[PDB]
Coordinates of C-alpha atoms and ligand atoms in Angstrom, one line a residue:
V129 CA 9.0 4.3 -31.2
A130 CA 11.9 6.7 -31.6
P131 CA 15.1 5.6 -29.9
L132 CA 16.2 7.4 -26.8
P133 CA 19.5 9.3 -26.8
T134 CA 22.3 6.9 -26.0
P135 CA 23.6 7.5 -22.4
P136 CA 27.2 8.9 -22.4
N137 CA 29.9 6.4 -21.5
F138 CA 27.5 4.0 -19.8
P139 CA 29.2 1.1 -17.9
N140 CA 30.0 -1.5 -20.6
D141 CA 29.2 -4.5 -18.4
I142 CA 25.7 -3.2 -17.5
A143 CA 23.3 -4.0 -20.4
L144 CA 20.8 -1.2 -21.2
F145 CA 17.4 -1.9 -22.8
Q146 CA 14.8 0.6 -24.0
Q147 CA 11.4 -0.5 -22.7
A148 CA 8.0 1.1 -22.3
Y149 CA 6.8 1.8 -18.8
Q150 CA 3.3 1.2 -17.5
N151 CA 2.2 1.0 -13.9
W152 CA -0.5 -1.5 -12.9
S153 CA -3.4 0.9 -13.2
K154 CA -2.0 2.0 -16.6
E155 CA -2.5 5.6 -15.5
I156 CA 1.2 6.1 -16.0
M157 CA 2.4 5.1 -19.5
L158 CA 5.6 6.1 -21.2
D159 CA 6.6 4.7 -24.6
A160 CA 10.3 4.7 -23.8
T161 CA 12.5 4.5 -20.8
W162 CA 16.1 3.2 -20.2
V163 CA 16.2 0.0 -18.1
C164 CA 18.9 -2.2 -16.8
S165 CA 19.1 -5.1 -14.3
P166 CA 22.0 -4.6 -11.8
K167 CA 23.5 -8.0 -11.0
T168 CA 24.8 -7.0 -7.5
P169 CA 24.4 -4.2 -5.0
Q170 CA 27.8 -2.8 -6.1
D171 CA 26.4 -2.4 -9.6
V172 CA 23.8 -0.1 -8.2
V173 CA 26.6 1.9 -6.7
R174 CA 28.3 2.1 -10.1
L175 CA 25.1 3.3 -11.6
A176 CA 24.7 6.0 -8.9
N177 CA 28.2 7.3 -9.4
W178 CA 27.8 7.2 -13.2
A179 CA 24.4 9.0 -12.9
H180 CA 26.0 11.7 -10.7
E181 CA 28.8 12.4 -13.1
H182 CA 26.4 12.7 -16.1
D183 CA 23.4 14.5 -14.4
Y184 CA 21.2 11.4 -14.8
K185 CA 18.7 10.1 -12.2
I186 CA 18.2 6.5 -11.1
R187 CA 14.9 5.0 -10.0
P188 CA 14.6 1.4 -8.6
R189 CA 12.0 -0.6 -10.5
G190 CA 10.0 -3.1 -8.5
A191 CA 6.7 -4.7 -9.6
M192 CA 5.5 -1.4 -11.1
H193 CA 2.3 -1.5 -9.0
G194 CA 2.9 2.1 -7.8
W195 CA 0.0 4.5 -8.5
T196 CA 2.0 7.4 -6.9
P197 CA 4.5 8.8 -9.5
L198 CA 7.6 8.0 -7.5
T199 CA 9.3 6.1 -10.4
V200 CA 8.4 8.1 -13.5
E201 CA 5.9 10.9 -14.0
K202 CA 3.2 10.8 -16.7
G203 CA 4.5 12.7 -19.7
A204 CA 7.9 13.5 -18.2
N205 CA 11.1 13.7 -20.2
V206 CA 13.1 10.6 -19.2
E207 CA 16.0 11.0 -21.5
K208 CA 18.2 11.4 -18.5
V209 CA 16.7 8.7 -16.3
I210 CA 17.8 5.1 -15.8
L211 CA 15.4 2.6 -14.3
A212 CA 17.1 -0.2 -12.3
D213 CA 15.1 -3.4 -12.3
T214 CA 15.8 -4.9 -8.9
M215 CA 13.7 -8.0 -9.3
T216 CA 15.9 -9.6 -12.0
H217 CA 18.9 -10.3 -9.7
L218 CA 18.6 -8.5 -6.3
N219 CA 16.2 -11.1 -5.1
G220 CA 18.2 -13.3 -2.7
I221 CA 16.4 -14.7 0.4
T222 CA 18.0 -16.2 3.5
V223 CA 16.3 -17.1 6.8
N224 CA 18.3 -16.5 9.9
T225 CA 17.0 -18.5 12.9
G226 CA 20.0 -17.9 15.1
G227 CA 19.2 -15.1 17.5
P228 CA 16.8 -13.4 20.0
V229 CA 14.2 -13.3 17.2
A230 CA 14.1 -15.0 13.8
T231 CA 14.8 -12.8 10.8
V232 CA 15.0 -13.0 7.0
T233 CA 17.4 -11.2 4.8
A234 CA 16.2 -10.4 1.3
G235 CA 17.4 -8.5 -1.7
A236 CA 15.2 -5.4 -2.3
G237 CA 13.9 -7.0 -5.5
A238 CA 12.5 -10.1 -3.9
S239 CA 8.7 -10.3 -3.8
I240 CA 6.9 -10.5 -0.5
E241 CA 5.3 -13.7 -1.5
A242 CA 8.7 -15.3 -2.2
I243 CA 9.9 -14.1 1.2
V244 CA 6.9 -15.4 3.2
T245 CA 6.9 -18.6 1.3
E246 CA 10.5 -19.2 2.5
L247 CA 9.4 -18.2 6.0
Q248 CA 6.7 -20.8 5.9
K249 CA 9.3 -23.5 5.2
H250 CA 10.7 -22.6 8.7
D251 CA 7.4 -22.3 10.4
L252 CA 7.7 -18.5 10.4
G253 CA 5.5 -15.7 9.0
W254 CA 4.2 -12.2 9.1
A255 CA 1.0 -11.1 10.7
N256 CA -0.2 -8.2 8.6
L257 CA 0.4 -8.9 4.9
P258 CA -0.5 -6.7 1.9
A259 CA -3.2 -8.4 -0.3
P260 CA -1.0 -8.9 -3.4
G261 CA 2.1 -11.0 -3.0
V262 CA 3.7 -9.8 -6.2
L263 CA 5.0 -6.6 -4.6
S264 CA 8.8 -6.2 -4.3
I265 CA 9.9 -5.8 -0.7
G266 CA 11.6 -2.6 -1.6
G267 CA 8.4 -1.2 -3.1
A268 CA 6.3 -2.4 -0.1
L269 CA 8.6 -0.8 2.5
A270 CA 8.7 2.4 0.5
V271 CA 5.0 3.1 1.3
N272 CA 4.6 1.3 4.7
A273 CA 2.7 -1.5 3.0
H274 CA 0.1 -3.2 5.2
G275 CA -2.8 -5.6 5.5
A276 CA -6.2 -5.6 7.3
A277 CA -4.9 -7.2 10.5
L278 CA -5.5 -6.4 14.1
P279 CA -5.3 -8.7 17.1
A280 CA -8.7 -9.8 18.4
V281 CA -9.7 -8.6 21.8
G282 CA -7.5 -10.4 24.3
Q283 CA -5.2 -11.8 21.6
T284 CA -1.5 -11.3 22.3
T285 CA 1.0 -10.2 19.6
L286 CA 3.4 -13.1 19.2
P287 CA 7.1 -12.3 19.5
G288 CA 8.3 -11.1 16.1
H289 CA 5.0 -10.1 14.7
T290 CA 3.6 -6.6 14.2
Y291 CA 0.1 -5.4 13.2
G292 CA 1.7 -2.2 11.9
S293 CA 3.4 -1.8 8.5
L294 CA 6.1 -4.0 7.1
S295 CA 8.4 -1.1 7.7
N296 CA 8.2 -1.7 11.4
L297 CA 9.8 -5.2 11.0
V298 CA 13.2 -4.0 9.7
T299 CA 16.1 -5.0 11.9
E300 CA 18.8 -3.8 9.4
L301 CA 19.1 -2.5 5.8
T302 CA 21.7 -1.6 3.2
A303 CA 21.4 1.3 0.8
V304 CA 23.5 3.3 -1.7
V305 CA 24.8 6.3 0.3
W306 CA 27.1 9.3 -0.4
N307 CA 30.2 8.8 1.8
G308 CA 31.6 12.3 1.2
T309 CA 33.4 11.8 -2.1
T310 CA 31.4 9.0 -3.8
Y311 CA 28.4 6.8 -3.5
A312 CA 28.9 3.5 -1.7
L313 CA 27.0 0.7 0.1
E314 CA 26.2 1.4 3.8
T315 CA 24.3 -0.7 6.3
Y316 CA 22.2 0.6 9.2
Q317 CA 20.9 -1.2 12.3
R318 CA 17.5 -0.6 13.8
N319 CA 19.2 1.0 16.8
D320 CA 20.8 3.6 14.5
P321 CA 19.1 7.0 14.6
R322 CA 19.9 7.4 10.8
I323 CA 17.7 4.4 9.9
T324 CA 14.2 5.7 10.7
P325 CA 13.7 7.8 7.7
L326 CA 14.8 4.9 5.5
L327 CA 12.2 2.4 6.8
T328 CA 9.5 4.1 4.8
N329 CA 11.3 6.2 2.2
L330 CA 9.0 6.6 -0.8
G331 CA 11.9 5.6 -3.1
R332 CA 14.0 8.6 -2.1
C333 CA 16.7 6.2 -0.9
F334 CA 17.9 3.2 -2.9
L335 CA 17.8 0.0 -0.8
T336 CA 19.7 -3.0 -2.0
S337 CA 18.8 -5.4 0.8
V338 CA 16.8 -5.6 4.1
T339 CA 16.6 -7.9 7.1
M340 CA 13.3 -8.2 8.8
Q341 CA 12.0 -10.0 11.9
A342 CA 9.5 -12.8 11.7
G343 CA 7.2 -14.4 14.2
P344 CA 5.9 -18.0 14.3
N345 CA 3.6 -18.9 11.5
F346 CA 0.0 -19.6 12.3
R347 CA -3.2 -21.0 10.8
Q348 CA -5.9 -18.6 9.9
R349 CA -9.6 -18.8 8.9
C350 CA -11.1 -16.3 6.4
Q351 CA -14.9 -16.1 6.3
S352 CA -16.8 -14.1 3.7
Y353 CA -20.3 -12.6 4.1
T354 CA -22.4 -11.0 1.4
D355 CA -25.7 -11.1 3.3
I356 CA -25.3 -8.1 5.7
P357 CA -27.0 -4.9 4.7
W358 CA -24.5 -2.0 4.6
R359 CA -26.3 0.1 7.2
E360 CA -26.1 -2.9 9.6
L361 CA -22.4 -3.6 8.9
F362 CA -21.5 0.1 9.1
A363 CA -23.7 1.0 12.0
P364 CA -23.2 3.5 14.9
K365 CA -21.0 2.7 17.9
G366 CA -22.5 0.0 20.1
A367 CA -25.2 -1.1 17.6
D368 CA -26.6 -4.6 17.8
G369 CA -26.3 -6.9 14.8
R370 CA -23.4 -8.0 12.5
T371 CA -21.3 -4.9 12.8
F372 CA -17.8 -4.1 11.6
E373 CA -16.7 -3.3 15.1
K374 CA -18.0 -6.6 16.5
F375 CA -16.1 -8.6 13.8
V376 CA -12.9 -6.7 14.7
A377 CA -13.3 -7.3 18.4
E378 CA -14.1 -11.0 17.9
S379 CA -11.5 -11.9 15.1
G380 CA -9.2 -8.9 14.6
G381 CA -8.8 -9.0 10.8
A382 CA -11.5 -7.5 8.6
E383 CA -12.1 -5.9 5.3
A384 CA -15.3 -4.7 3.6
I385 CA -15.7 -4.2 -0.2
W386 CA -18.9 -2.3 -0.9
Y387 CA -19.8 -2.0 -4.6
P388 CA -21.4 1.2 -5.9
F389 CA -25.2 1.3 -5.8
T390 CA -25.5 -2.1 -3.9
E391 CA -27.2 -3.1 -0.7
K392 CA -24.7 -5.6 0.8
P393 CA -20.9 -5.4 0.9
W394 CA -18.5 -8.4 0.6
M395 CA -17.2 -8.6 4.1
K396 CA -14.1 -10.7 4.9
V397 CA -13.1 -11.7 8.4
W398 CA -9.8 -13.4 9.4
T399 CA -9.6 -15.4 12.6
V400 CA -6.5 -17.0 14.0
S401 CA -6.8 -20.6 15.0
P402 CA -6.1 -21.7 18.7
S403 CA -1.8 -30.9 10.9
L404 CA -5.5 -30.0 10.9
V405 CA -5.4 -29.1 14.6
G406 CA -7.6 -26.0 14.9
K407 CA -9.4 -26.2 11.6
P408 CA -13.1 -25.3 11.9
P409 CA -15.2 -28.3 10.8
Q410 CA -17.1 -26.0 8.4
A411 CA -14.0 -24.5 6.8
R412 CA -12.3 -25.7 3.6
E413 CA -8.6 -26.2 3.9
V414 CA -6.5 -24.4 1.2
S415 CA -2.8 -24.9 0.6
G416 CA -2.1 -21.9 -1.7
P417 CA -3.0 -18.2 -1.9
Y418 CA -5.4 -16.3 -4.2
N419 CA -8.6 -18.2 -3.4
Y420 CA -11.1 -15.9 -5.0
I421 CA -10.8 -16.9 -8.6
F422 CA -14.0 -15.1 -9.6
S423 CA -12.4 -11.8 -8.8
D424 CA -9.1 -12.4 -10.6
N425 CA -11.0 -13.5 -13.7
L426 CA -14.2 -11.7 -15.0
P427 CA -16.9 -13.0 -17.5
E428 CA -18.0 -11.4 -20.7
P429 CA -21.1 -9.4 -19.5
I430 CA -18.8 -7.8 -17.0
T431 CA -15.9 -7.1 -19.4
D432 CA -18.5 -5.7 -21.8
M433 CA -19.7 -3.3 -19.1
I434 CA -16.1 -2.2 -18.4
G435 CA -15.5 -1.8 -22.1
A436 CA -18.7 0.3 -22.5
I437 CA -17.8 2.5 -19.5
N438 CA -14.3 3.1 -21.1
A439 CA -16.1 4.0 -24.3
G440 CA -17.9 6.9 -22.6
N441 CA -20.9 5.3 -20.9
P442 CA -20.5 6.1 -17.2
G443 CA -24.2 5.7 -16.7
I444 CA -23.6 1.9 -16.5
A445 CA -22.4 2.4 -12.9
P446 CA -25.8 1.6 -11.3
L447 CA -25.7 -1.7 -13.2
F448 CA -22.0 -2.4 -12.8
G449 CA -21.9 -2.3 -9.0
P450 CA -24.8 -4.9 -8.6
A451 CA -23.2 -7.1 -11.4
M452 CA -19.9 -7.2 -9.5
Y453 CA -21.7 -8.0 -6.2
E454 CA -23.6 -10.8 -7.9
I455 CA -20.4 -12.3 -9.4
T456 CA -18.9 -12.2 -6.0
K457 CA -21.9 -13.8 -4.2
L458 CA -22.3 -16.5 -6.9
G459 CA -18.5 -17.1 -7.2
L460 CA -18.0 -17.5 -3.5
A461 CA -20.8 -20.1 -3.4
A462 CA -19.8 -22.0 -6.5
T463 CA -16.2 -22.3 -5.5
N464 CA -17.0 -22.9 -1.8
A465 CA -14.7 -20.0 -0.8
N466 CA -17.0 -18.4 1.8
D467 CA -15.2 -20.2 4.6
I468 CA -11.5 -21.1 4.0
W469 CA -8.6 -21.9 6.3
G470 CA -4.8 -22.4 5.9
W471 CA -1.5 -20.8 6.7
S472 CA -1.3 -17.0 7.1
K473 CA 0.0 -16.3 3.6
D474 CA -2.6 -18.5 1.9
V475 CA -5.5 -16.6 3.3
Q476 CA -4.0 -13.1 3.5
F477 CA -2.7 -13.0 -0.1
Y478 CA -5.8 -12.7 -2.2
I479 CA -5.2 -10.1 -5.0
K480 CA -3.7 -11.1 -8.3
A481 CA -2.6 -8.4 -10.8
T482 CA -5.3 -9.7 -13.2
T483 CA -8.0 -8.1 -11.1
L484 CA -9.8 -5.0 -12.6
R485 CA -7.5 -2.0 -12.9
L486 CA -8.7 0.8 -10.6
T487 CA -7.4 4.0 -9.2
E488 CA -8.0 5.0 -5.5
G489 CA -8.7 7.9 -3.2
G490 CA -9.4 8.2 0.6
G491 CA -6.7 7.5 3.2
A492 CA -6.0 6.6 6.8
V493 CA -7.7 7.7 10.0
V494 CA -5.3 7.2 13.0
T495 CA -7.3 6.9 16.1
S496 CA -8.3 4.9 19.2
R497 CA -9.6 1.3 18.6
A498 CA -12.8 2.3 20.4
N499 CA -13.5 4.8 17.6
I500 CA -13.7 2.3 14.8
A501 CA -17.5 2.1 14.5
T502 CA -17.9 5.9 14.5
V503 CA -15.2 6.6 11.9
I504 CA -16.8 4.0 9.6
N505 CA -20.4 5.0 10.2
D506 CA -19.5 8.7 9.5
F507 CA -17.7 7.9 6.3
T508 CA -20.1 5.4 4.8
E509 CA -23.1 7.6 5.4
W510 CA -21.3 10.6 3.9
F511 CA -20.3 8.6 0.9
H512 CA -23.8 7.2 0.4
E513 CA -25.2 10.8 0.4
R514 CA -22.6 12.0 -2.1
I515 CA -22.9 9.3 -4.6
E516 CA -26.7 9.8 -4.7
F517 CA -26.2 13.6 -4.8
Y518 CA -24.4 13.2 -8.1
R519 CA -26.8 10.6 -9.4
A520 CA -29.5 13.1 -8.8
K521 CA -27.8 15.4 -11.3
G522 CA -27.3 12.5 -13.8
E523 CA -23.6 12.2 -13.0
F524 CA -21.7 9.0 -12.2
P525 CA -18.2 9.8 -11.0
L526 CA -18.1 6.6 -8.9
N527 CA -18.1 3.2 -10.4
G528 CA -15.7 1.3 -8.2
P529 CA -16.2 0.0 -4.6
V530 CA -15.6 1.6 -1.2
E531 CA -13.0 -0.6 0.6
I532 CA -12.5 -0.4 4.4
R533 CA -10.0 -2.2 6.6
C534 CA -8.1 -1.5 9.8
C535 CA -4.7 -2.6 11.1
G536 CA -2.3 -1.6 13.9
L537 CA 0.4 1.0 14.1
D538 CA 4.2 0.7 14.1
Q539 CA 4.3 -0.2 17.8
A540 CA 7.7 -0.1 19.5
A541 CA 6.8 -3.1 21.6
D542 CA 6.5 -5.2 18.5
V543 CA 10.2 -4.7 17.7
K544 CA 12.3 -7.4 19.3
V545 CA 15.8 -6.0 18.5
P546 CA 17.3 -2.8 19.9
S547 CA 15.5 0.1 18.1
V548 CA 15.5 3.9 18.1
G549 CA 11.9 4.0 17.0
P550 CA 9.3 3.6 14.3
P551 CA 9.6 4.7 10.6
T552 CA 9.8 8.5 10.6
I553 CA 7.2 9.2 7.9
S554 CA 5.0 6.1 7.8
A555 CA 1.3 6.7 8.0
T556 CA 1.3 4.0 10.6
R557 CA 3.7 5.8 12.9
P558 CA 2.2 6.2 16.4
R559 CA 1.5 9.7 17.7
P560 CA 3.4 10.5 20.9
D561 CA 0.8 13.1 21.9
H562 CA -1.9 10.5 21.7
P563 CA -0.8 7.1 23.2
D564 CA -4.5 6.0 23.0
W565 CA -4.5 6.2 19.2
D566 CA -3.6 2.6 18.3
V567 CA -5.3 1.8 15.0
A568 CA -5.2 2.9 11.4
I569 CA -8.5 2.8 9.7
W570 CA -8.1 2.7 5.9
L571 CA -11.0 4.3 4.1
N572 CA -10.6 3.9 0.3
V573 CA -12.7 4.5 -2.8
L574 CA -11.8 2.8 -6.1
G575 CA -12.9 3.7 -9.6
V576 CA -12.2 3.1 -13.3
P577 CA -9.3 5.3 -14.6
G578 CA -10.6 8.1 -16.9
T579 CA -14.1 8.3 -15.3
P580 CA -15.3 11.9 -15.7
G581 CA -15.7 13.7 -12.4
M582 CA -14.0 10.9 -10.4
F583 CA -11.0 13.0 -9.5
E584 CA -13.2 16.0 -8.7
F585 CA -15.0 13.7 -6.3
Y586 CA -11.7 12.4 -4.8
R587 CA -10.8 16.0 -4.1
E588 CA -14.1 16.6 -2.4
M589 CA -13.6 13.5 -0.3
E590 CA -10.0 14.4 0.6
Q591 CA -11.2 17.8 1.8
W592 CA -14.0 16.3 3.8
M593 CA -11.7 13.7 5.4
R594 CA -9.1 16.3 6.3
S595 CA -11.8 18.5 7.9
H596 CA -13.7 15.7 9.6
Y597 CA -10.9 13.4 10.9
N598 CA -8.4 16.0 12.2
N599 CA -9.4 16.6 15.8
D600 CA -8.7 15.8 19.4
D601 CA -9.7 12.2 18.8
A602 CA -8.1 11.4 15.4
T603 CA -5.8 12.5 12.7
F604 CA -6.1 11.9 8.9
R605 CA -3.1 10.8 6.8
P606 CA -3.2 10.1 3.1
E607 CA -2.2 6.5 2.1
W608 CA 1.2 7.1 0.4
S609 CA 0.6 4.4 -2.2
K610 CA -2.8 5.7 -3.3
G611 CA -4.0 9.0 -4.7
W612 CA -3.9 12.2 -2.7
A613 CA -3.4 15.9 -3.2
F614 CA -6.2 15.9 -5.8
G615 CA -6.2 19.2 -7.6
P616 CA -8.4 17.6 -9.0
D617 CA -5.9 15.2 -10.6
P618 CA -4.0 13.3 -8.0
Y619 CA -0.6 14.7 -6.9
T620 CA -1.4 18.1 -8.5
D621 CA -2.7 20.2 -5.6
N622 CA 0.5 22.2 -5.0
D623 CA -0.5 23.4 -1.5
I624 CA -1.1 19.9 -0.3
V625 CA 2.1 18.5 -1.9
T626 CA 4.4 21.3 -0.8
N627 CA 2.9 22.4 2.5
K628 CA 0.2 20.2 3.9
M629 CA 2.0 16.9 3.7
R630 CA 4.8 18.4 5.7
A631 CA 2.3 19.8 8.2
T632 CA 0.7 16.4 8.6
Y633 CA 4.1 14.9 9.5
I634 CA 5.5 17.5 11.9
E635 CA 2.2 17.4 14.0
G636 CA 2.5 15.8 17.4
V637 CA 6.1 14.7 17.0
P638 CA 9.5 15.9 18.1
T639 CA 11.4 18.5 16.0
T640 CA 14.3 16.0 16.2
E641 CA 12.3 13.2 14.5
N642 CA 9.8 14.5 12.0
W643 CA 9.2 15.3 8.3
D644 CA 12.1 17.7 8.3
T645 CA 14.4 15.2 10.0
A646 CA 13.6 12.8 7.2
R647 CA 14.3 15.3 4.4
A648 CA 17.6 16.1 6.0
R649 CA 18.6 12.5 6.2
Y650 CA 17.6 11.8 2.6
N651 CA 19.6 14.8 1.4
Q652 CA 22.7 13.9 3.4
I653 CA 22.6 10.4 1.9
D654 CA 21.9 11.7 -1.6
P655 CA 23.0 15.4 -1.8
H656 CA 23.1 15.2 -5.6
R657 CA 19.5 14.0 -5.8
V658 CA 20.2 11.1 -8.0
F659 CA 17.3 9.2 -6.5
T660 CA 14.5 11.6 -7.4
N661 CA 12.2 12.9 -10.1
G662 CA 10.2 16.1 -10.6
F663 CA 7.4 15.1 -8.2
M664 CA 9.8 14.0 -5.5
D665 CA 11.5 17.4 -5.7
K666 CA 8.2 19.1 -4.8
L667 CA 7.3 16.7 -2.0
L668 CA 10.8 16.1 -0.5
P669 CA 13.0 19.1 -1.2
Ligands
LIG122 C1 -1.1 -2.7 -7.9 C2 -1.5 -3.0 -6.5 C3 -0.8 -2.4 -5.4 C4 -1.3 -2.5 -4.1 C5 -2.5 -3.4 -3.8 C6 -3.1 -4.0 -4.8 C7 -2.8 -3.8 -6.2 C8 -3.5 -4.4 -7.3 N1 -2.8 -3.8 -2.5 C9 -2.1 -3.3 -1.4 C10 -2.3 -3.8 -0.1 O1 -3.1 -4.7 0.2 N2 -1.6 -3.1 0.9 C11 -0.6 -2.1 0.7 O2 -0.2 -1.6 1.6 N3 -0.4 -1.7 -0.6 C12 -1.0 -2.3 -1.7 N4 -0.7 -1.9 -2.9 C13 0.2 -0.7 -3.1 C14 1.7 -1.1 -3.1 O3 2.1 -1.4 -1.8 C15 2.5 0.0 -3.7 O4 2.0 0.3 -5.0 C16 3.9 -0.4 -3.8 O5 4.8 0.8 -3.6 C17 4.2 -1.1 -5.1 O6 5.5 -1.9 -5.0 P1 6.2 -2.3 -6.3 O7 7.0 -3.6 -5.9 O8 5.3 -2.5 -7.4 O9 7.1 -1.2 -6.7 P2 7.2 0.0 -7.7 O10 5.9 0.5 -8.2 O11 8.2 -0.3 -8.7 O12 7.7 1.2 -6.9 C18 6.8 1.7 -5.8 C19 7.7 2.6 -4.9 O13 8.8 1.8 -4.2 C20 10.0 2.5 -4.4 N5 11.0 1.4 -4.5 C21 11.0 0.3 -5.2 N6 12.1 -0.5 -5.0 C22 12.8 0.1 -4.0 C23 14.2 0.0 -3.6 N7 15.0 -1.0 -4.0 N8 14.7 0.9 -2.7 C24 13.9 2.0 -2.4 N9 12.7 2.3 -2.8 C25 12.2 1.4 -3.6 C26 9.8 3.2 -5.7 O14 10.8 4.3 -5.9 C27 8.4 3.8 -5.4 O15 8.4 4.9 -4.6

């Protein structure tokens, strides 16, 4: 690969390396980018000032799992961009148990698994964890990362825990900010009006460290079911049988993975226990995360199907879905993983980077908890109709599963330190005009990158969701980390990117704390737009 132009008078003590860039899904691949690993937060400041003086941009580089082009854009000229790998050195972790609520301070490059592993050593933990522990905390906060957790009916939220996004747990953070004449480190407390836009910032701000509250750790069971027909699981409100709503009411945490052209989803249900005290007799105790080995490692017949699909055989979809379901059903049985139990992190962390690479569509439906069944029944029935509609024309734009899970919102009551409010632009931010809306229902669809017609379908779905879930009883918000603004390619519908996202985030909230308030804060902190790229300029001018 041709060497990139040498950056002018780059700091001599900050080593620069030319490396390729590839996000997890591999949808974003650049043969060359400049990368460095700042040893301390002050080195990021030095980078920012150097970047400003030479018209270069700086992007923090976490675990590179990002689908949304917030680091680098596909095919973009990055001759004037420096990527700052934060996981090399900015990964310190310190637990603070002296105060009103326990907290943990971590460099922005520390992985969430590393953070919660340390919390576990102090009998502490987080209630709503994202599925993969490899994510950097900086990258997780940037998109209001979350899990599939909700408290069961009657279950109280323990002091320190939140069922909203990880962004709601921040008690303080430090970022590189313009002080009027130069960039410098600045720290903000949760009771500081200037902090809310920074809690979920999409990488528009460069965080060097964060402090987050933690609640007591807890034991949790995770039961899997693959014997419930989809129409029963996703039935109308009040239906009898093994319904999604009944699982959420009884256990709180739940996630369904429904493979294309299959009869029964893989349903996971998490239940908190009331040192084996509380372990269900039938459950297998685990002492580590990632207990679904069959999903993080696929056999030849399956890898061959994936290879053939990539070679231009989308018609394999009707065989691929069932094959994935069978691997799951058989794998869960063979490894005795249908009923496991252990500490929170061990049953909530279940996705390894080795899982099949997929791209996603869909989003979040913010509404009242009593509306869960209806939202899910409507979506699944619509999806079912659409996939068959295309099959009827000999088209297979969908070869990945439908994934559905709910969690809470960034409730103010969960914050145990003085606070001015929830993250300004998190999809999990409560709606003031609708106090009864207390859950976020994540409706996602996954598919193999490059599948013909897939993005056209995601656009069709995005349009249906916006029209269907924006009413007096619910609001639709794209999941920042996934695909959205499909035009048809994700992030290319100019009207959605430059007008509708703003509209979504000014709706129902004060003019003193909305999308515009956030943009203003981001620009005040970085008036020279050092922490941006082309896409960010369209989304957050
Ligand atoms: C790959 C993947 C991701 C994923 C998932 C499963 C897989 C296989 N499961 C998720 C889950 O269960 N729940 C959830 O909410 N998200 C899940 N994701 C998506 C993941 O959260 C996002 O992709 C996340 O942003 C990725 O974090 P990562 O650590 O990989 O970071 P990155 O791609 O480099 O950058 C992502 C964004 O974060 C900003 N960023 C990164 N570091 C910082 C610092 N220091 N300061 C400010 N912003 C930061 C980047 O700019 C970018 O916008």
